[PDB]
Amino acid sequence: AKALAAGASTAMLGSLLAGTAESPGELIFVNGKQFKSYRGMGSLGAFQDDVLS
Amino acid sequence: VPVPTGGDDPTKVAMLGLTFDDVLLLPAASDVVPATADTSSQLTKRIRLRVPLVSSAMDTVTESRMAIAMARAGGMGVLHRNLPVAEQAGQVETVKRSEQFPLSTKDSDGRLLVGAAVGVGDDAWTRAMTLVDAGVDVLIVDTAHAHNRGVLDMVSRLKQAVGERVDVVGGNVATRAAAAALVEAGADAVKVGVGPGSICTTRVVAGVGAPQITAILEAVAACKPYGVPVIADGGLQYSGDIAKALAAGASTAMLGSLLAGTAESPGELIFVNGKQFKSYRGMGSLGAFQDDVLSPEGIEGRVPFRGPLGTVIHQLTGGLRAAMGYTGSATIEQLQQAQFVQITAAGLK
Amino acid sequence: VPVPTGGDDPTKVAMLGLTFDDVLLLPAASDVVPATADTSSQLTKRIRLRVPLVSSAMDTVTESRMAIAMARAGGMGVLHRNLPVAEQAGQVETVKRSEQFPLSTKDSDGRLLVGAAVGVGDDAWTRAMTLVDAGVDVLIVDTAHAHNRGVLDMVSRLKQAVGERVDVVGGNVATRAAAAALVEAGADAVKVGVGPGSICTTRVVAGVGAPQITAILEAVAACKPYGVPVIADGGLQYSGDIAKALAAGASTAMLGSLLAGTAESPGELIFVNGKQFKSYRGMGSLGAFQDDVLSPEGIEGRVPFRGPLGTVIHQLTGGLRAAMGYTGSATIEQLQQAQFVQITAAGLK
Amino acid sequence: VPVPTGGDDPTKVAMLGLTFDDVLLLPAASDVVPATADTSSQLTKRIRLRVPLVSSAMDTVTESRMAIAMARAGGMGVLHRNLPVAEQAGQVETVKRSEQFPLSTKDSDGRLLVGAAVGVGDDAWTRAMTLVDAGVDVLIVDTAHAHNRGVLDMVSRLKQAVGERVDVVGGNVATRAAAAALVEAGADAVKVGVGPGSICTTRVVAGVGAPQITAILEAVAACKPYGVPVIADGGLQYSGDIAKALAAGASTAMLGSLLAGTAESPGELIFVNGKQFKSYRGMGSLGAFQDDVLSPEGIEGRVPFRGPLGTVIHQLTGGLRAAMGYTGSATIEQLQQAQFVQITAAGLK
Amino acid sequence: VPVPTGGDDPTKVAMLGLTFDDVLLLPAASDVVPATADTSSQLTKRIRLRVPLVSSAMDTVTESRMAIAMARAGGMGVLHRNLPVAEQAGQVETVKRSEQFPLSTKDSDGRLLVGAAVGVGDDAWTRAMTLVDAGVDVLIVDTAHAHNRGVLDMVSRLKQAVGERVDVVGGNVATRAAAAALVEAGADAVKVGVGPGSICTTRVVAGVGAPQITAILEAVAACKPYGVPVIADGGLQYSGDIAKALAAGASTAMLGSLLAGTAESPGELIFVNGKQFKSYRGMGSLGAFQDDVLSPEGIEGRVPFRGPLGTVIHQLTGGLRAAMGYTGSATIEQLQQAQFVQITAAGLK
Ligand SMILES: O=c1[nH]cnc2c1ncn2[C@@H]1O[C@H](COP(=O)(O)O)[C@@H](O)[C@H]1O
Ligand SMILES: O=c1[nH]cnc2c1ncn2[C@@H]1O[C@H](COP(=O)(O)O)[C@@H](O)[C@H]1O
Ligand SMILES: O=c1[nH]cnc2c1ncn2[C@@H]1O[C@H](COP(=O)(O)O)[C@@H](O)[C@H]1O
Ligand SMILES: O=c1[nH]cnc2c1ncn2[C@@H]1O[C@H](COP(=O)(O)O)[C@@H](O)[C@H]1O
Ligand SMILES: O=c1[nH]cnc2c1ncn2[C@@H]1O[C@H](COP(=O)(O)O)[C@@H](O)[C@H]1O
């Protein structure tokens, strides 16, 4: 709401959608809880020819 | 001259009681593939289950859904009695009315088997007659201490009245004398265990109990010459415990907390800090028609959610099949003759 | 040829000592409803209590308020002696001067029973005479090690002087020989236990102690042929422990920390982080008229607030009644003949 | 009349099983300097190792690098079989082709000794023939329960076919009868242990196991009159455990997790919060050609990085030499006659 | 037919070993006031101490200051040997040259008694001769395993040379045979204990040890008929342990970590987070003239600062006096005849 009130017409969402069921990656179980992976495009683990990634 | 533990009476301390953690199964000459082991065993003298497991008659474990799932999985379910008689009769009728399940247990009419638990008294007699009319298969005279005169009299009356239509299973016992008394009364099966938990509330509040392995051995020592099956009830935590109980002479194992967290058990799923839990209370707990005098003698708690009942039953049956393969037991009657090795405290760390 | 534990003397290690956690009560043929079990038991040869419980003679447990509450609840209280003689006589008079309480213990004049603790010596003799004049009912010759010559001589002197007006109870013993010596001296009851706690300070500082079950068995083995009751003192943590102590042959159980946190005990209520606690110290502690040579041999601490004494007494009596129902004991004299089952370390986890 | 542990059969509980933590080595008359103790021992009837240690045939312990390192250190390595036959033959060839190492174990051609593990079946027969053609020295018929008819038949067939070129070692056993059966089949050595871990998955899932000291004693009691060596496999955590295993009659000790964290073991080094660890999983784990029916029966985990294998081997050999000096054993054959002292639970805290 | 623990040899497991935590002292007929108990005991056949305590010959426990303090407190100190011979002779001379201390132990010339520790060898022979010339009173042939031929030969040589001027104490033993061998060699006293700690490094690294109570009993069973005193060395944690060791037959107790944290012990005081600690390491530790072959077999650590040595000695002596009062022992020779009661694991929680 703050981003749209500042003048932006659209908001792009990252981690808020990473843990959903429709996102890629395998579901992980840790101590009775459920988690999913999330990494940036500039991370060490992650065609990424971006110099400033 | 005196007893090394004190006093002059050698029988003041009757025996040394072994529990599940005190023994292990010794491997023997085995020509049995675990995938081909026959796990069928007698529940009563006239009922044979494909999987020797029975659901506990507890208000947080067995209702119509759990009874149907257990009957489909190869075992049987015993409906609890912490509710009005008409509701229990309705549950029995619901179970009876209900190629995926080749191991399902069914009567001569093709309907799933079900068991019901009754108490002691005139109200319990009316409940038993209503349940028999509803089509129940086996009645369990469920009492905390079955060596009472009233429990034996109730078992005898039930066998006199509806002894040919249904089966009668006696309450919990822990000694050879009590098992012999139940057999004399006319029970079709004997349920064994009184304070089998390590920190069971009866052992703390009343100081009364009996280790499960020794109790099973003594009860089998009294029941076996007459062909009366034994149901080990309580204290089981793993499939290894089930294998140990069946190797001590018991023909059936009754499961409690192992089935409480399944999806087929009653109660609403609870979410705590990202984890899933379900309620679990004893019939003698403060929170929990419970006219049992010796049934607070229990506690409330929660157990983690485990999923579908079939997965848990399959895991337990796989553990039992592994034990049968190790001991070289083609059938349960051959597993009941396996030998034990007693381990010290060092082997429990 | 040699002893398997080392050396050549087979009696160097006298016996194997069982504690409360090593035994359980075996169920037996029971026709007893727990609500109708008779819990009355002898305190001395001439005094019978409706509830077989007695409050410890400790400065943080028993004073006039606690003694009156115990006498109303069906048991009795023993006033401590860590104060001037006149103050103890005043406490006795306060207790004696004071349909809600059908189980109250009273003398032939309708006044509540009370007991007082005395030491050994001429000052203790003056204290005992003052307490007898004040109207005390039973005198406890309270010593840590009662097998001393002086303790027996004091017991004999008390029985010679006021043996017909009041009763005399010997100090703490842990062997059959000491109990026999106390019986020969003329004690009306024998109090049993020397270092009964698992981590008791006597066992750590002095290396001296005796497990409570074996000590009770040996003391009963010496006291029973003469009709001298036994008071198990120390080591009790649950109602199951009380049932085990009474089933081993003891006629009365003396309670310490179980009654320290009640509202009727002396001391000011303490608040810590939103919780309530009260002080609790042994008579041999550094902080705590204590002319006992073998009485630092104790520690200070705090116990949670428990509320009114009646609730705790009712809980303990309910546990005892449950044990009596399980063992089929209509009276305490029938509970004293119950059998034990010995459990391994695996059953204590 | 009945057994004190319950029942009427005195052989229902066969024996009391001692583990490594239950015993200690008693010092004796010693004229042996630890630096001059001879640690050489028989692996099979025809192979003698300078250091009586063997690496486990596990996918996270022994490969070509670890096998070469073990052969150089004075012991031997057994290559695992969780891979295609051609790959295992390549590993054997790599080991065979490969003054720093005066204790290295070599054949008559000057090439390092190596062992390979095979299963039971026709595919296992093809694997064994391929490994023999590749130049393997000893074949281990690795099964979880070696008292099966098929395992004995496979051992007999292998001894009939390639019994003069290579040696045959039987699978894991835990009883005297199984060891005698393996000896009769024609095994050159017997590997001992079935559920030797304290919390091993077989003991929890299947309820089957045997304490290692008693199993070693029984297997030696059957193998020694025929000169068949014994390899204690599993349960070893310290060099003291190795000394205890060799003192019970075993001629060789097989090491698992003690060698998993070394640099010569397979797997990539893992960094967690500034520390170094390596993977370790059982052959029966879910993550882990494993046609063993009784092989989930294992768990995955990680063990800390330990460095070069030589340091660990030197530490273990120093501990063994210290034990030999304490017991006055000039050779391993004299260490196999040392006496044990059994300790209680108090000495394990 | 076979042994219940496995095998055919009934002597493979020699005995069951009891430690300090396995036993308690039984009260007996007592006419002894703890304040008047005589604690004097023999150190050697010619030396009697007023307090039966001796300081360990460790580099972090006993030097000249600690030796003087121990000699003043009523016991004696044994100077360690982890230093050049001239320095040890200087320490002995410093101790010998140095109404407050009525219990001080002194020779016929009024100078404090002191003991010194020597090894085995020609350098140790030169050290022993230098120490004798410096005026030492007793020489301790300190070896980890005293059943060696060289240790006995050294003891015999020392007794032949300076046997009339000074006393000779044999190294650590744990069996009856070793104690008998030391007595035959001519030792004036026998020091007892080999791996007495529960998690002692010898028991973990080498798997060799012996519980202290059984070892003391066996050594007394060999030393007592000849009047050779016994010094229990190691495993003591409380004053109750000292009382138990003296009640098992030992005449003197040697103290380690109990005296390491005192102000009279060597080493610099260390401050950590507002608390005070001091170093403590074994003679077999990596950090620690130690020509002992079987002496890493020890660990380093720190113990809290305890203050002056006299306070600790008084606390230990008070505990011993309490034990003597409980057991009715007027002298240590009467405490050496007290009886034990064996407790189970339940009484150790
Ligand atoms: O590796 C990375 N470093 C920095 N920004 C990244 C990286 N990968 C993606 N982004 C951008 O940062 C945003 C983070 O979204 P958020 O996680 O919802 O805040 C993404 O939607 C991309 O636009
Ligand atoms: O409150 C209770 N106290 C004692 N036993 C109970 C109570 N409720 C049920 N039981 C019995 O104890 C068994 C415990 O099963 P478990 O939890 O699998 O050991 C149940 O199946 C019942 O037979
Ligand atoms: O300082 C002390 N040391 C040892 N025993 C004590 C001490 N003070 C009281 N006692 C006795 O030990 C008992 C302990 O009771 P408990 O706390 O209920 O086990 C008391 O009731 C007294 O009989
Ligand atoms: O998955 C498994 N379950 C049970 N035993 C196994 C498994 N994998 C290997 N073993 C055996 O158990 C031993 C354990 O060795 P440790 O880890 O040194 O005790 C191995 O050396 C194998 O002989
Ligand atoms: O490094 C060592 N390993 C084993 N025993 C040792 C070592 N150093 C000293 N000792 C002995 O073990 C005893 C331990 O005493 P404690 O610490 O009082 O139990 C010492 O007094 C020595 O007799």
mmCIF file of N, CA and C in Angstrom, chain B residues 94-162:
data_model
loop_
_atom_site.group_PDB
_atom_site.id
_atom_site.type_symbol
_atom_site.label_atom_id
_atom_site.label_comp_id
_atom_site.label_asym_id
_atom_site.label_seq_id
_atom_site.Cartn_x
_atom_site.Cartn_y
_atom_site.Cartn_z
ATOM 1 N N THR B 94 -22.569 -47.580 11.986
ATOM 2 C CA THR B 94 -21.832 -46.871 10.945
ATOM 3 C C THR B 94 -20.650 -47.692 10.449
ATOM 4 N N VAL B 95 -19.919 -48.325 11.369
ATOM 5 C CA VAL B 95 -18.799 -49.172 10.965
ATOM 6 C C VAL B 95 -19.299 -50.369 10.165
ATOM 7 N N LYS B 96 -20.393 -50.989 10.611
ATOM 8 C CA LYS B 96 -20.885 -52.186 9.934
ATOM 9 C C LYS B 96 -21.436 -51.871 8.547
ATOM 10 N N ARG B 97 -22.027 -50.688 8.362
ATOM 11 C CA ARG B 97 -22.595 -50.344 7.061
ATOM 12 C C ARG B 97 -21.509 -50.015 6.044
ATOM 13 N N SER B 98 -20.427 -49.382 6.482
ATOM 14 C CA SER B 98 -19.334 -49.030 5.582
ATOM 15 C C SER B 98 -18.599 -50.271 5.088
ATOM 16 N N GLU B 99 -10.848 -53.659 -4.397
ATOM 17 C CA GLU B 99 -9.552 -54.316 -4.516
ATOM 18 C C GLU B 99 -8.463 -53.491 -3.843
ATOM 19 N N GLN B 100 -8.850 -52.332 -3.302
ATOM 20 C CA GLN B 100 -7.879 -51.468 -2.641
ATOM 21 C C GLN B 100 -7.325 -52.108 -1.374
ATOM 22 N N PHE B 101 -8.126 -52.918 -0.685
ATOM 23 C CA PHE B 101 -7.798 -53.412 0.651
ATOM 24 C C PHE B 101 -7.913 -54.930 0.650
ATOM 25 N N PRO B 102 -6.894 -55.628 0.142
ATOM 26 C CA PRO B 102 -6.935 -57.098 0.146
ATOM 27 C C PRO B 102 -6.848 -57.707 1.534
ATOM 28 N N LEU B 103 -6.385 -56.958 2.533
ATOM 29 C CA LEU B 103 -6.193 -57.476 3.880
ATOM 30 C C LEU B 103 -7.343 -57.143 4.820
ATOM 31 N N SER B 104 -8.438 -56.586 4.309
ATOM 32 C CA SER B 104 -9.525 -56.159 5.182
ATOM 33 C C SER B 104 -10.121 -57.347 5.927
ATOM 34 N N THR B 105 -10.501 -57.112 7.180
ATOM 35 C CA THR B 105 -11.087 -58.135 8.037
ATOM 36 C C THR B 105 -12.604 -58.005 7.994
ATOM 37 N N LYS B 106 -13.284 -59.078 7.596
ATOM 38 C CA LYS B 106 -14.729 -59.045 7.434
ATOM 39 C C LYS B 106 -15.341 -60.316 8.002
ATOM 40 N N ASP B 107 -16.610 -60.209 8.387
ATOM 41 C CA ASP B 107 -17.355 -61.341 8.920
ATOM 42 C C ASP B 107 -17.862 -62.208 7.768
ATOM 43 N N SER B 108 -18.751 -63.153 8.081
ATOM 44 C CA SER B 108 -19.291 -64.040 7.058
ATOM 45 C C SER B 108 -20.237 -63.322 6.104
ATOM 46 N N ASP B 109 -20.710 -62.131 6.462
ATOM 47 C CA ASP B 109 -21.589 -61.348 5.604
ATOM 48 C C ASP B 109 -20.840 -60.331 4.753
ATOM 49 N N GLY B 110 -19.514 -60.281 4.849
ATOM 50 C CA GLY B 110 -18.743 -59.335 4.068
ATOM 51 C C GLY B 110 -18.663 -57.941 4.640
ATOM 52 N N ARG B 111 -19.003 -57.762 5.912
ATOM 53 C CA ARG B 111 -18.947 -56.464 6.563
ATOM 54 C C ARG B 111 -17.767 -56.417 7.526
ATOM 55 N N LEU B 112 -17.186 -55.227 7.661
ATOM 56 C CA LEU B 112 -15.983 -55.054 8.463
ATOM 57 C C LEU B 112 -16.243 -55.411 9.921
ATOM 58 N N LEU B 113 -15.246 -56.021 10.557
ATOM 59 C CA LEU B 113 -15.354 -56.371 11.964
ATOM 60 C C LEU B 113 -15.140 -55.138 12.832
ATOM 61 N N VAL B 114 -15.791 -55.134 13.993
ATOM 62 C CA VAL B 114 -15.682 -54.031 14.937
ATOM 63 C C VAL B 114 -15.852 -54.578 16.346
ATOM 64 N N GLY B 115 -15.216 -53.914 17.301
ATOM 65 C CA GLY B 115 -15.340 -54.282 18.695
ATOM 66 C C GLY B 115 -15.772 -53.090 19.521
ATOM 67 N N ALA B 116 -16.404 -53.385 20.651
ATOM 68 C CA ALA B 116 -16.903 -52.341 21.533
ATOM 69 C C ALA B 116 -16.506 -52.651 22.966
ATOM 70 N N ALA B 117 -16.312 -51.596 23.752
ATOM 71 C CA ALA B 117 -15.901 -51.704 25.145
ATOM 72 C C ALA B 117 -17.070 -51.390 26.066
ATOM 73 N N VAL B 118 -17.246 -52.218 27.097
ATOM 74 C CA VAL B 118 -18.292 -52.030 28.091
ATOM 75 C C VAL B 118 -17.656 -52.092 29.473
ATOM 76 N N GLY B 119 -18.356 -51.528 30.447
ATOM 77 C CA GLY B 119 -17.923 -51.518 31.828
ATOM 78 C C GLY B 119 -18.525 -52.651 32.631
ATOM 79 N N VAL B 120 -18.743 -52.395 33.919
ATOM 80 C CA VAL B 120 -19.343 -53.365 34.827
ATOM 81 C C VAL B 120 -20.539 -52.718 35.511
ATOM 82 N N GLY B 121 -21.692 -53.379 35.442
ATOM 83 C CA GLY B 121 -22.896 -52.867 36.066
ATOM 84 C C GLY B 121 -24.154 -53.125 35.262
ATOM 85 N N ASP B 122 -25.296 -52.645 35.762
ATOM 86 C CA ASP B 122 -26.552 -52.825 35.041
ATOM 87 C C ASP B 122 -26.620 -51.909 33.824
ATOM 88 N N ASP B 123 -26.130 -50.675 33.965
ATOM 89 C CA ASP B 123 -26.031 -49.780 32.819
ATOM 90 C C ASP B 123 -25.093 -50.361 31.771
ATOM 91 N N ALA B 124 -23.978 -50.946 32.215
ATOM 92 C CA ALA B 124 -23.085 -51.627 31.287
ATOM 93 C C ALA B 124 -23.758 -52.829 30.638
ATOM 94 N N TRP B 125 -24.632 -53.527 31.367
ATOM 95 C CA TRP B 125 -25.369 -54.634 30.764
ATOM 96 C C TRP B 125 -26.307 -54.143 29.666
ATOM 97 N N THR B 126 -27.015 -53.040 29.919
ATOM 98 C CA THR B 126 -27.874 -52.465 28.887
ATOM 99 C C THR B 126 -27.053 -52.015 27.685
ATOM 100 N N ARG B 127 -25.892 -51.406 27.940
ATOM 101 C CA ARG B 127 -25.005 -51.000 26.856
ATOM 102 C C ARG B 127 -24.562 -52.201 26.032
ATOM 103 N N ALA B 128 -24.191 -53.294 26.702
ATOM 104 C CA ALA B 128 -23.742 -54.488 25.997
ATOM 105 C C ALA B 128 -24.858 -55.083 25.152
ATOM 106 N N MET B 129 -26.077 -55.139 25.692
ATOM 107 C CA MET B 129 -27.192 -55.667 24.911
ATOM 108 C C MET B 129 -27.487 -54.785 23.702
ATOM 109 N N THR B 130 -27.443 -53.463 23.882
ATOM 110 C CA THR B 130 -27.649 -52.558 22.756
ATOM 111 C C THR B 130 -26.577 -52.749 21.688
ATOM 112 N N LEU B 131 -25.316 -52.882 22.107
ATOM 113 C CA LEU B 131 -24.229 -53.072 21.151
ATOM 114 C C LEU B 131 -24.357 -54.401 20.417
ATOM 115 N N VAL B 132 -24.756 -55.460 21.125
ATOM 116 C CA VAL B 132 -24.960 -56.751 20.472
ATOM 117 C C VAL B 132 -26.079 -56.652 19.447
ATOM 118 N N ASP B 133 -27.169 -55.967 19.800
ATOM 119 C CA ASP B 133 -28.256 -55.776 18.847
ATOM 120 C C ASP B 133 -27.799 -54.971 17.635
ATOM 121 N N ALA B 134 -26.917 -53.991 17.844
ATOM 122 C CA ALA B 134 -26.412 -53.191 16.734
ATOM 123 C C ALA B 134 -25.500 -53.971 15.795
ATOM 124 N N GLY B 135 -25.039 -55.151 16.189
ATOM 125 C CA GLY B 135 -24.207 -55.975 15.345
ATOM 126 C C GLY B 135 -22.730 -55.980 15.670
ATOM 127 N N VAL B 136 -22.352 -55.712 16.921
ATOM 128 C CA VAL B 136 -20.945 -55.737 17.296
ATOM 129 C C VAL B 136 -20.420 -57.167 17.237
ATOM 130 N N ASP B 137 -19.116 -57.297 17.000
ATOM 131 C CA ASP B 137 -18.490 -58.604 16.850
ATOM 132 C C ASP B 137 -17.850 -59.097 18.138
ATOM 133 N N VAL B 138 -17.169 -58.224 18.876
ATOM 134 C CA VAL B 138 -16.517 -58.610 20.121
ATOM 135 C C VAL B 138 -16.737 -57.517 21.160
ATOM 136 N N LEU B 139 -17.033 -57.938 22.386
ATOM 137 C CA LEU B 139 -17.224 -57.052 23.522
ATOM 138 C C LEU B 139 -16.025 -57.190 24.448
ATOM 139 N N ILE B 140 -15.454 -56.059 24.841
ATOM 140 C CA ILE B 140 -14.314 -56.013 25.744
ATOM 141 C C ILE B 140 -14.819 -55.508 27.086
ATOM 142 N N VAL B 141 -14.717 -56.348 28.113
ATOM 143 C CA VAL B 141 -15.067 -55.919 29.458
ATOM 144 C C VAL B 141 -13.852 -55.167 29.974
ATOM 145 N N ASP B 142 -13.861 -53.855 29.735
ATOM 146 C CA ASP B 142 -12.718 -52.966 29.924
ATOM 147 C C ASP B 142 -12.736 -52.443 31.353
ATOM 148 N N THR B 143 -11.854 -52.978 32.187
ATOM 149 C CA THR B 143 -11.673 -52.499 33.546
ATOM 150 C C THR B 143 -10.188 -52.346 33.829
ATOM 151 N N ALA B 144 -9.866 -51.408 34.721
ATOM 152 C CA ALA B 144 -8.470 -51.167 35.059
ATOM 153 C C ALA B 144 -7.877 -52.335 35.832
ATOM 154 N N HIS B 145 -8.678 -52.993 36.664
ATOM 155 C CA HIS B 145 -8.224 -54.117 37.479
ATOM 156 C C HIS B 145 -9.256 -55.226 37.304
ATOM 157 N N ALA B 146 -8.940 -56.201 36.456
ATOM 158 C CA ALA B 146 -9.896 -57.226 36.060
ATOM 159 C C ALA B 146 -9.965 -58.401 37.024
ATOM 160 N N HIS B 147 -9.139 -58.427 38.065
ATOM 161 C CA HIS B 147 -9.198 -59.509 39.039
ATOM 162 C C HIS B 147 -10.300 -59.313 40.071
ATOM 163 N N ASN B 148 -11.212 -58.375 39.841
ATOM 164 C CA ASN B 148 -12.344 -58.182 40.731
ATOM 165 C C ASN B 148 -13.403 -59.252 40.496
ATOM 166 N N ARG B 149 -14.181 -59.531 41.544
ATOM 167 C CA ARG B 149 -15.252 -60.516 41.435
ATOM 168 C C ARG B 149 -16.321 -60.054 40.453
ATOM 169 N N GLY B 150 -16.644 -58.759 40.477
ATOM 170 C CA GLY B 150 -17.680 -58.241 39.598
ATOM 171 C C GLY B 150 -17.324 -58.357 38.129
ATOM 172 N N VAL B 151 -16.054 -58.129 37.789
ATOM 173 C CA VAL B 151 -15.625 -58.237 36.397
ATOM 174 C C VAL B 151 -15.772 -59.671 35.901
ATOM 175 N N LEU B 152 -15.345 -60.639 36.715
ATOM 176 C CA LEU B 152 -15.488 -62.041 36.337
ATOM 177 C C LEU B 152 -16.955 -62.425 36.204
ATOM 178 N N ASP B 153 -17.795 -61.943 37.123
ATOM 179 C CA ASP B 153 -19.221 -62.236 37.044
ATOM 180 C C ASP B 153 -19.837 -61.643 35.782
ATOM 181 N N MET B 154 -19.441 -60.419 35.426
ATOM 182 C CA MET B 154 -19.950 -59.793 34.210
ATOM 183 C C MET B 154 -19.511 -60.561 32.970
ATOM 184 N N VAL B 155 -18.258 -61.023 32.948
ATOM 185 C CA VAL B 155 -17.779 -61.809 31.812
ATOM 186 C C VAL B 155 -18.572 -63.105 31.694
ATOM 187 N N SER B 156 -18.816 -63.770 32.827
ATOM 188 C CA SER B 156 -19.601 -65.001 32.816
ATOM 189 C C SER B 156 -21.024 -64.749 32.331
ATOM 190 N N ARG B 157 -21.643 -63.657 32.787
ATOM 191 C CA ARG B 157 -23.001 -63.337 32.355
ATOM 192 C C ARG B 157 -23.056 -63.048 30.861
ATOM 193 N N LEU B 158 -22.076 -62.302 30.346
ATOM 194 C CA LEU B 158 -22.054 -62.005 28.919
ATOM 195 C C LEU B 158 -21.864 -63.272 28.096
ATOM 196 N N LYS B 159 -20.991 -64.175 28.551
ATOM 197 C CA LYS B 159 -20.810 -65.432 27.832
ATOM 198 C C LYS B 159 -22.053 -66.308 27.906
ATOM 199 N N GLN B 160 -22.770 -66.275 29.030
ATOM 200 C CA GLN B 160 -24.012 -67.033 29.139
ATOM 201 C C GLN B 160 -25.082 -66.487 28.201
ATOM 202 N N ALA B 161 -25.160 -65.162 28.070
ATOM 203 C CA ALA B 161 -26.229 -64.543 27.290
ATOM 204 C C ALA B 161 -25.928 -64.544 25.794
ATOM 205 N N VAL B 162 -24.849 -63.877 25.386
ATOM 206 C CA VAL B 162 -24.557 -63.680 23.969
ATOM 207 C C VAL B 162 -23.215 -64.307 23.616
#
